[PDB]
Amino acid sequence: VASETLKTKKMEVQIKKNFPSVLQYTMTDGKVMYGQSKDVRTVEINGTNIELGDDDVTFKKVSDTEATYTLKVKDEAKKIDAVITVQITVKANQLHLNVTKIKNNLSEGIPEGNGVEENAIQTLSFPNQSLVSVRSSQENAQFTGARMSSNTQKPGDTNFAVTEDTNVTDSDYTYGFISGAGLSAGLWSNSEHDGTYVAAPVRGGSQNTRVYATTQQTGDATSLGLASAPWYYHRTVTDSKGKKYTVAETALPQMAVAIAGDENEDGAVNWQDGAIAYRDIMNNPYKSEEVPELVAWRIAMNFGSQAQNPFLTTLDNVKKVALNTDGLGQSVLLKGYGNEGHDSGHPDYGDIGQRLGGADDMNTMMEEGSKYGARFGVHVNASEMYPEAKAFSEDMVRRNSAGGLSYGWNWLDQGVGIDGIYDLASGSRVSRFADLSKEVGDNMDFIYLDVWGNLTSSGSEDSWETRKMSKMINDNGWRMTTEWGSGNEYDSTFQHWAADLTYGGYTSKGENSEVMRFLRNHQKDSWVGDYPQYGGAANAPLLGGYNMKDFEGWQGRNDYAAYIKNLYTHDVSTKFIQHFKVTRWVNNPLLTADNGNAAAVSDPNTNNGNEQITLKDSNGNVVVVSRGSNDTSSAAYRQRTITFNGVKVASGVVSAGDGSATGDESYLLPWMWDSFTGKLVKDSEQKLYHWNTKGGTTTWTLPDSWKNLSSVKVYQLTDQGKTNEQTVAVSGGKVTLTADAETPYVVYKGEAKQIQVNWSEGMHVVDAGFNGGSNTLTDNWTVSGSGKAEVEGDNNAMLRLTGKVDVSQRLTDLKAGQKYALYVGVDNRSTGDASVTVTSGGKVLATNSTGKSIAKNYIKAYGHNTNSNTENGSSYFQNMYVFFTAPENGDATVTLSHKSTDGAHTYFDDVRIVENQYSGITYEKDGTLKSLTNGFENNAQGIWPFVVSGSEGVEDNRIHLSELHAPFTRAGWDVKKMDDVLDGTWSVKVNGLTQKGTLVYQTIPQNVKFEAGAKYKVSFDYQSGSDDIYAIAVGQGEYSAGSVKLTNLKKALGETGKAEFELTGGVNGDSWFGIYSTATAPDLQGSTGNAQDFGGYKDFVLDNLKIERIESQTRTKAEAQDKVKEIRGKYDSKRAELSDAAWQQYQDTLVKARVLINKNGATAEDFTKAYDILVALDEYMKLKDLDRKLLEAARAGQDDEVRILMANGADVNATDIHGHTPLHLAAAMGHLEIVEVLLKNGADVNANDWRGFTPLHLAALNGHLEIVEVLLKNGADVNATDTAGNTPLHLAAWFGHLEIVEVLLKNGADVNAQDKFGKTAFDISIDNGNEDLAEILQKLG
Ligand SMILES: [Mn+2]
Ligand SMILES: [Mn+2]
Ligand SMILES: [Mn+2]
Ligand SMILES: [Mn+2]
């Protein structure tokens, strides 16, 4: 066989001239490794194997390190005619085989827009190429392979001896290493092939197998050789609509081997030796070099327009974690960074959440946080989208075989699957990442790709697709991170279901492979950590494993202390270990002869034959992690010792990662690296992290570079940073440390200076979140008053006020003459008012206040929800707003204050100053509300003036600000029957909250304040899917069922409806209105499946709210005096006959009104307010259900009972659930003996009900000739169009009566009137099926 030789200082490779093949590798020491010793010249194209002849291969030795081959690959029958150019290069102990050019003589290339390239070279391989091989005739001939396993009970590895009986053909592995005759080598390929896996719950590149092992006979022996799995070149793919595409290669085909001897000098030559060498040739995930620095992983969540975590709050929280960890690196995943929050706006990647502070605040957060070693990344979705998203198009939609939508999940809106192949082949996805790139430049660290591999985008989402997905992302300078534990083996540096050990159970975790973890532990957080509950891989892995907890809303996670406790429990040590590369791993108790690991490295001379891992860095430092015993029944199985350069730095049992049992582990870990590129720090910066689980006193040997010190400085780490400096003596290079249980300490060689932190940079105040300790109330905020101001809270610190106290601070960096919103979270337990006020040189620009807070916080992702115990096991925190214009003066100041000097507490947190164009609030001269309008077009956050109620308890509330994207968000697109937006770009949307029997959302006095005794006209535009599904609720104080007044609303589905009612301020000023979910079931109109959800039958949209004060009539001292006489006469003698709690509320109002009336020097305004309050008291004192019994009396036919209730004092225009007044309920039943008497008492004859009609329509429909004539006399609207369109003339002819038409037309009924349907007066009688009504219609009409 004509050959030639390639040379390096480490080896000489003999290569065949007739094909790109190796005969042998001969190391400097003479050890030889075989290649393909047999004449094998196979080239596979598009699945057809073609054997290449002598005339088909051209050879050129370029240099001593390189050869070029030109392969004439042809098959006329199978439409194959290509020219493959192969390069072979040698470098040190490595060999590379690259396909550098692929010329297709049957194609002019891919037509524009990734059209189908006919006879395209889709796949390429060299079957049984045997680039590297071992024979059964060689000393210790063995194979080690690795496949994907997300199951802690099932290893992904295999280890067996290569014996005469070894028979395999194209056996695929993610990794394969062969060893024998004192040399080991693994094969690397960039192949995107999907194959054999052990356990994986998803696709998304989990099944990437790039090595193919095959046996053949080499005379005497059986030879096992490794080849690369097939490569994809110009692959043809099909979208959900059947449209076919040809997409170019992700990269050209590449492969390599690295020949190793006894690399770890352990006297054995096995896969571990090849693995060490493999690192020099293997692909490395982009930005994997930074993984060891990411000590503090967490998610900062935003959801449902709430803006729970604006970008500049996230920066303050980075500073808090930096102080508590002494500056260890961080990785913050922004979940809901975009659009309205999490699972909103998918897949508009470039739409940075405007309510969070937009791209401007994101960049500030990223640039500034980077100074503290914090990395930032965003949660994106490439599988599901919502109609709101500007990317939503018919082409983007995934469709099924039937041609219908591939529906996603319904929550705030209905998600629709994205056609993944379209999104890739059209260039759509890559332009959306480009949109984000434009916003973030080079500031953002990573992308977090959710769900990829679950098969929502297509039934494929394979390694080829995943590779192209990771490329798009890496090309914009972003490190790849994803959801599923097994997902994206090639490019992911983090799996959420690997790092958050709680999800999915033991079958769905990180990578369970010794081979994979050996090779890449330092490059990823994608392994199995401690979660003993799962067993196997999760029972005290020696290398640790990232254990992720969160404190910023993700899944209601708000516990800061547990977050930090967990960092020091598992993640400091895990990260320390990641600064070293595994070089040896013996006695793995997971690997047995029974699970396919007979040949696994089992040394009885290291660690008593129990598990041990040795790791080293590029500087020759050695870490040794040892398991106390390989018996899971022994207490020692969970005992680990860690040594750094032969010195004990950690010992014990970690507290169980599943939170089941605390341990005893104590450590003194040398942290020698900066939190940036991880370069070594200087001696004055060299530090040790100390942790003692049980607490107590432990003695330790300091690292060698500390042996000559006489003392050390120890600081206890808090949210304030380095505290309680201790000087500890050093005797014989040893220290004694007393530590409290689960408490962090940092040890320095000398005195260390405090990390400089300037709280709330860019937030227009200093320390907006109250994280500066007790000290902020001295240094940043200014306290004045008799009362008490304290920074209370061991978790999320708040401001706690007691008595008369003013906490104030100057506003900075405001834009002169620009409109700003200033909101603060407030929880008021005091009856005395709690205020927010913006002033300029003594002038009050804006003020707002709250009495006792009347609504518990149900926002899951918010820091102070009712599950957070602010005081007495609850949280009533809700954002209180002020709107002002920044002064030209340039001198503005905020004041948080408490008015009454009672004992009760007021809680404030998160002072937010944000540019805002809202101007819908118009006041009176006295400062109270004249009117409020909201089109929801400028909401700083949330559904303001409404606040979310408890129909779903503490949840990621299915209520948010809906966005316009026509035609997709409008009624009529697909199965959609309701508009998301009624007016402008925004509305308040409720999704599927039917049959709750409780309040959905409501106004609160701190947003809308309804003055005791004052009348208001509440009006809004709305859309409700079904009749009686939602209701307007009218209450006083904290909501209690049976204490609220409901008005069930009519179906407005695709047509904006209108609602308006009169609200009278409750005697205690805690009156409000909102939306209530009734008990009646939706009218799904025969919808099946997701159609029930998307349709809108279960939904409620509200827009254009108008609240107007109705100016009352001016009263005299007299009118009011007389009203006290009247009110007391009716309810005095009835002393505790009804209630005792309601007697206190009655007596307190009579005192209030008397004060106003009798104040020496009172005025008409005092007299008319005392009278209006009294009128409202008389209404509260109608506790005996008279109003609900009067309506019950006109119904049944009780002509005698209406007489009793009316005179007694029941409401003249009392309404039921359908807005029927006593006139409506009696005009329809045919009771003239009830209507004649009710009309006399000034009962609203022109009052509109549920269907928008007056008792004219109800007296005409049921066939009452006596009630219609007496109604028109009393001033009934003959020309009255209802919400349904029908006037009293129309409905009179529909049932079957004529007589009414003549009595209506006489009074002035419009015959030319046309309803909403399109029917007129005469047109109705044609389809009636009778000419008995039509005859008198044609005579006059
Ligand atoms: Mn070795
Ligand atoms: Mn706070
Ligand atoms: Mn609007
Ligand atoms: Mn939405």
Residue numbers in the entry: 340 to 1680
Quote the original article.
Here, we show how peptide and protein targets can be reproducibly crystallised as “guests” in a host crystal under predefined conditions, and we explain the advantages and current limitations of the host lattice-display method. In order to apply this approach to biological macromolecules, we engineered a host lattice comprising auxiliary- and target-binding domains; Fig. 1B outlines the design strategy. The auxiliary domain defines the robust host lattice by providing the majority of crystal contacts, and thus also the crystallisation conditions. It serves as a scaffold for rigidly positioning the target-binding domain to immobilise guest molecules at well-defined positions.
Based on the previous findings we selected two different orientations, L1 from rotation 4 and L2 from rotation 9, and introduced additional crystal contacts by inter-molecular disulfide bridges. EngBF-DARPin construct L1 has a shorter shared helix, but the molecular packing only permits binding of small targets. To test if a single disulfide bridge stabilises the DARPin and allows target binding, we introduced mutations Lys1655 → Cys and Ser342* → Cys (*refers to a symmetry-related molecule) between the DARPin C-cap and the N-terminus of a symmetry-related EngBF domain. The Cys1655-Cys342* disulfide bridge confers sufficient rigidity to identify the DARPin domain.
